[PDB]
């Protein structure tokens, strides 16, 4: 099934009458407007392109403005595509609200993880540190050996090394839906989701089920 584009508002909790505190992530899901419908005949695959939010008119380029004008919708902050499931039909200009998740139970949330910059092997790959004392010379958090000897004579591809950590697309699966509030355009899911406050999120019905 199709999903919706939302925004990470932050985390809080929901106290139940039983006395259980549920950690929840608040996702603001405003109306998603269909901008284009892909069909097998013209594009070779079935999908819908949606936009959400608003954008300053002075920031919309003429190429982008023309695209929105054909659909007849106001400009949003971006464009996202969702693959259709054959039994699903949508029209250009249609608005989809958070009511889609009324009876979904479990969702998969995709977002961009927080960026950690250049990370070492201890942090990036959970490498063990060498001895802090007992003679160690300038080698407390260094990687150690990176290969064997002459037989290979090289380092193998995929060797875990220091480098950029974070700032990448991540999907968390099978998150329980706690509350769907159409009036407030809100979706509450149990647990933490990737990204910082204010980041764009992609919510879809759970695939594993």
């Amino acid at each position: 099934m199709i999903g919706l584009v939302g925004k990470k508002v932050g985390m809080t909790r929901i106290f139940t009458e039983d006395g259980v505190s549920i950690p929840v992530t608040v996702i603001e899901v405003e109306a998603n407007r269909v901008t284009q419908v892909k069909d097998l005949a013209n594009d070779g695959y079935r999908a819908i392109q949606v936009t959400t939010g608003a954008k300053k008119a002075n920031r919309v380029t003429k190429p982008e403005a023309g695209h929105f004008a054909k659909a007849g919708v106001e400009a949003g902050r971006g464009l996202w595509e969702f693959r259709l499931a054959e039994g699903e039909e949508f029209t250009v200009g249609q608005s989809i609200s958070v009511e889609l998740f009324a009876d979904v139970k479990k969702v998969d949330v995709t977002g961009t993880s927080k960026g950690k910059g250049f990370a070492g092997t201890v942090k990036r790959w959970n490498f063990r540190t060498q001895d802090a004392t007992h003679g160690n010379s300038l080698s407390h958090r260094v990687p150690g050996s990176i290969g064997q000897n002459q037989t290979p004579g090289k380092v193998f591809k995929g060797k875990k090394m220091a480098g950029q950590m974070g700032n990448e697309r991540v999907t968390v699966q099978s998150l329980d839906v706690v509350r769907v509030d159409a009036e407030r355009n809100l979706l509450l899911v149990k647990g933490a989701v990737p990204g910082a406050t204010g980041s764009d999120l992609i919510v879809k019905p759970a695939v594993k089920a």
Partner: protein
């Protein structure tokens, strides 16, 4: 959070005063034992006419920890010291007949029901 080499107080009248954890039973590379968990212990100090002697290796269930226990609402109950109740090595079942000090509601599990009944509090 009790691990190997951790010393514990004894919350029963078995005769032991201080015990040392020598193994955290349960799985490969299991690091810590908390509250309801069972550990292998060695008796380090004991009273003269007790049921157990110094040097004995047997089992025990943790009942109080300084780290504490979390509750479903997010609350936490902490204690000032780590304590355990000695169990028979073969069939568990407390060796002692009296429990000293408060215990927690994480122990009621049919396996440790005798402890609950004998505890002064909770």
């Amino acid at each position: 959070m009790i691990q190997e080499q951790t010393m514990l107080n004894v919350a029963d009248n078995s005769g032991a005063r201080r015990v040392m954890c020598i193994k955290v039973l349960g799985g490969s590379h299991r690091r810590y034992a908390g509250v309801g968990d069972i550990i292998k212990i060695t008796i380090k100090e004991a009273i003269p006419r007790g049921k157990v002697k110094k040097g004995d290796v047997l089992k025990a269930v943790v009942v109080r920890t300084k780290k504490g226990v979390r509750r479903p609402d997010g609350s936490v109950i902490r204690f000032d010291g780590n304590a355990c109740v000695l169990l028979n090595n073969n069939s568990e079942q407390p060796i002692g007949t009296r429990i000293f000090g408060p215990v927690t509601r994480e122990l009621r599990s049919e396996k440790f029901m005798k402890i609950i009944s004998l505890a002064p509090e909770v």
